[PDB]
Design a protein around this nucleic acid. Sequence first.
DNA 1: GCGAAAAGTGTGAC
DNA 2: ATATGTCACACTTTTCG
DNA 3: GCGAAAAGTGTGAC
DNA 4: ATATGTCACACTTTTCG
Lengths: 197, 199
Amino acid sequence: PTLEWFLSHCHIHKYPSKSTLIHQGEKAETLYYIVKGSVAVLIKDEEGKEMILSYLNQGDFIGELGLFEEGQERSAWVRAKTACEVAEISYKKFRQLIQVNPDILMRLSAQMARRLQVTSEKVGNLAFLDVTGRIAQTLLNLAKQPDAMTHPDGMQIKITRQEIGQIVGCSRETVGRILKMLEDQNLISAHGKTIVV
Amino acid sequence: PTLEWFLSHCHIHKYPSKSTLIHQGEKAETLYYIVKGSVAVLIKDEEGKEMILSYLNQGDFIGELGLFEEGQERSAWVRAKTACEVAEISYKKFRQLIQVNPDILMRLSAQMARRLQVTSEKVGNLAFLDVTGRIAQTLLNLAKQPDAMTHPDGMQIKITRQEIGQIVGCSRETVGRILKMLEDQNLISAHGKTIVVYG
DNA sequence: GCGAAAAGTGTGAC
DNA sequence: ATATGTCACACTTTTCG
DNA sequence: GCGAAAAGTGTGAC
DNA sequence: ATATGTCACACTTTTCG
């Protein structure tokens, strides 16, 4: 609909998996769009520890926060979870496409709107739930979003305790002994893959 | 400017301190705007422990997360920190107000860009810093807010150690202690009103 | 500006 | 208290040419 | 579906 | 190896009518 006139004016690129689309602090000049695939947003403490803030996918805009004031820089990091085709438009041409048609600027804002809600939750979990709890929300919320494939009884999913470790914010081994205390307790089963029940 | 174009379409409302302007469950259908005053956004623990997410000052929009979808609830709480003339429109008259002068969709979206930056940072702080870390930072920030009196040396923040405990995610006593330590180092001076930068 | 009622705060071994 | 992190390395379990 | 690295992971007790 | 949460209430400071 609106997207094709939009998606026409962009330069399109294919990023191999694990590439770095965006760097923290780099000066924000380009908006992006995930035409194919998925990406990861994560930030970093000067002493190297990193935390995933979210997974983004086909349909979502990227690097939109730089768009509204200028001077500023990329707020987070965006790596390629897998291959992607990314339409890229300078802020400037986009600042224009909005003057022609108001619909794409909305299609952005809706996007930032649910992300400001999904993020605020994440603050509350970090502050109210102990790790064990955050991990069960992660294993629920993960095991549903499109990556997840319909297990007979309780969807399945592929995640490393390492990575659960950077969403929940604890470490592979604590993620470890706890996860098991779930299999035992009986609300999940796992072995490389994680079978939610 | 057309912000006035906006208010002249809106309808004000006077609130008093501590009054909860929005509540975490109800249906979003109005989009506030803070004429005069400050308000605080916070969520709650399964039993009441609050966690203030951010304060919102005059010239801010409130409850704009429903504006882009139907039948979504209000996601947090918002209580007047002070008195607040808070303008109102409704979702639809607002969209009707958009397809005409695109400007304020822009002025709203911009505020929602900052918020995700600030909130992203907060999740950095909770996940990376330890309490003295997070409390120093809270103090760097509030020292920087709009509601901060000037002091010869440093900024005079006015605040309740109970509040810092909420903002930061720690209990009341932990704040009291840390606050003490920082004074001993001569980094602040406290007594209800606090001064950041020695004293 | 008054103070009385309400709200805020330390303390310390687990 | 009570919850969670941090150590080394041989260990699985998953990678793919 | 072949094995061989490459990843990813469980110790425990401070 | 560690940090911060806990519990009660005299005592201190803020509120607001």
